[PDB]
């Protein structure tokens, strides 16, 4: 009946000395490599096990997956979000609000043709966009989480923003710096030491300040929605959950009321910007790294679609090597390497090991993705990882960028079909020009915490 071993913890700093804040995975894989697999940690005062390579984490997530459905702490998200909305919460809470979330996504239809011609258009829309930046040297930044961020929000709000409009503009701002924050080395020393951290001055401040920001714009578009509601035909994502508060209201116990609604909606809007993004801004740079497999995958299009029409995304099936280089951007880039944090709900038994109700678990996801079992060469970008002798396409165990068991990324679904055409359509009509040789592109990360961000770099968008 005993905790799995680890470093010893000084009172309230915890393992603060044997962990780089500026590297929180090769510090935490570091002593891993020391204890094994399955190790304890503390971030300061709160007491982590930490979870390494496919084994551990399948066997976690998977195996036991309802005692390890519990939700962990991230202080920053958590300072807005004080347990509420469907991905920071816990329990009953959390069953409802993803249940809900899941079956609603469904009726405006992801993976489905609605959503397939909602991003076929808005792709188009980008198309056009960089079509009309003539060749010239620009940051992809803002036009790829524009073009995400507008079918996340066709879903949520009912319609689509304007390119040009100046306050969409500071959304994205608000989210790029706020998400950035979490994968720095004060963002990683916040997850420590959040209880005195957040009455000092700091760039955790200017972070609370654009949280604040984002709460405060999608509660003002549930105000203009509740007013011109109508009960019998809902219009988007907000509108169905006010159509199911009413509902409840006769009920006490209902999770649906105004601030699970408008939180809820944030972590929609949040995730379904930053991450598909991100995720694309690595990829592009990826590819001008290694021009021979830009070269495989135009060729590709070329036979497969052509020049004419839009791809769809059943043009995916006979499509092996473009399937396959999205999967290794998605492997490489590394997401989300810690994931978000899980928790065990009750007295859990696991390996031997004995985690008490509440133990706060980190599922290394980047370790899964780099698991040598499942990988030859783990941190080259090889696509050949996911495919066979004969060319075909390779599923692996070890692709979990997405997570794994009962508490996994429910925006897969959508994630999956908006990369594929995302990159398809891009790369069908232009190909990148770096300013800078290949072999002079730096690839790796700028920052890794929450997040992996990767490096800033200019390109260009030259036709075909
Ligand atoms: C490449 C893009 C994406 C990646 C790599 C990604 C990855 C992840 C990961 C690792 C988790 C953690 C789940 C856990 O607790 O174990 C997660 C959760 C979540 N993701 Fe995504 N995600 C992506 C895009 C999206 C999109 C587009 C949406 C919008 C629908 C979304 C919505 C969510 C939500 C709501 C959760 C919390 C689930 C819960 O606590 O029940 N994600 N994602
Ligand atoms: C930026 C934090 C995001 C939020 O508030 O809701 C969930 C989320 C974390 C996340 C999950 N999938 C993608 N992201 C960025």
């Not at 992801?110 to 940051?139: M, P, S, W």
């Not at 654009?210 to 549930?222: M, N, P, R, S, T």
């Not at 396409?393 to 508490?407: E, H, L, M, N, T």
Request: net charge positive.
């Amino acid at each position: 009946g005993k905790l799995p071993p680890g470093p010893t913890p000084l009172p309230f700093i915890g393992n603060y000395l044997q962990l780089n804040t500026e590297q929180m995975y090769n510090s935490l894989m570091k002593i891993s490599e020391r204890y094994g697999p399955v190790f304890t940690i503390h971030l300061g005062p709160r007491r982590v096990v930490v979870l390494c390579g496919h084994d551990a984490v399948k066997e976690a997530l998977v195996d036991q997956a309802e005692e390890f459905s519990g939700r962990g702490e991230q202080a920053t998200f958590d300072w807005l979000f004080k347990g509420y909305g469907v991905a920071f919460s816990n329990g009953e809470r959390a069953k409802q609000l993803r249940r809900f979330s899941i079956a609603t996504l469904r009726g405006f239809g992801v993976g489905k043709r609605g959503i397939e011609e909602r991003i076929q258009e808005e792709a188009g829309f980008l198309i056009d966009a960089l079509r009309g930046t003539h060749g010239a040297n620009i940051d992809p930044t803002f036009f790829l989480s524009r073009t995400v961020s507008n079918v996340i929000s066709s879903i949520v709000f009912g319609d689509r923003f304007d390119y040009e409009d100046k306050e969409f503009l500071s959304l994205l701002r608000m989210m790029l710096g706020s998400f950035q924050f979490t994968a720095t080395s004060t963002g990683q020393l916040y997850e420590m030491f959040s209880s005195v951290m957040k009455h000092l001055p700091g760039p955790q401040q200017q972070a609370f300040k654009e949280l604040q920001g984002l709460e405060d714009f999608i509660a003002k578009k549930v105000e203009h929605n509740q007013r011109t509601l109508d009960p019998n035909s809902p219009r988007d994502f907000i509108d169905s959950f006010l159509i199911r508060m009413q509902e409840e209201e006769k009920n006490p116990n209902t999770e649906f009321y105004l601030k699970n609604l408008v939180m809820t909606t944030l972590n929609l809007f949040f995730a379904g910007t930053e991450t598909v993004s991100t995720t694309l801004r690595y990829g592009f740079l990826l590819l001008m790294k290694h021009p021979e497999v830009e070269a495989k995958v135009h060729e590709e299009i070329d036979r497969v679609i052509g020049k004419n029409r839009q791809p769809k995304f059943e043009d995916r099936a006979k499509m092996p090597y473009t399937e396959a280089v999205i999967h290794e951007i998605q492997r490489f880039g590394d997401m989300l390497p810690m994931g978000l944090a899980h928790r065990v709900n009750k007295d859990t038994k696991f390996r031997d090991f004995f985690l008490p109700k509440g133990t706060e678990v980190f599922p290394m996801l980047g370790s899964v993705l780099r698991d040598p079992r499942f990988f030859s060469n783990p941190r080259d970008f090889n696509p050949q990882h996911f495919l066979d002798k004969k060319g075909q396409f390779k599923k692996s165990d070890a692709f979990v960028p997405f997570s794994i068991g009962k508490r996994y990324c429910f925006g897969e679904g959508l994630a999956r079909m908006e990369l594929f055409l995302f990159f398809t359509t891009i790369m069908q009509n232009f190909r990148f020009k770096s300013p800078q040789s290949p072999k002079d592109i730096d690839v790796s990360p700028k920052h890794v915490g929450f997040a992996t961000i990767p490096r800033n770099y200019t390109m260009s968008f030259l036709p075909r």
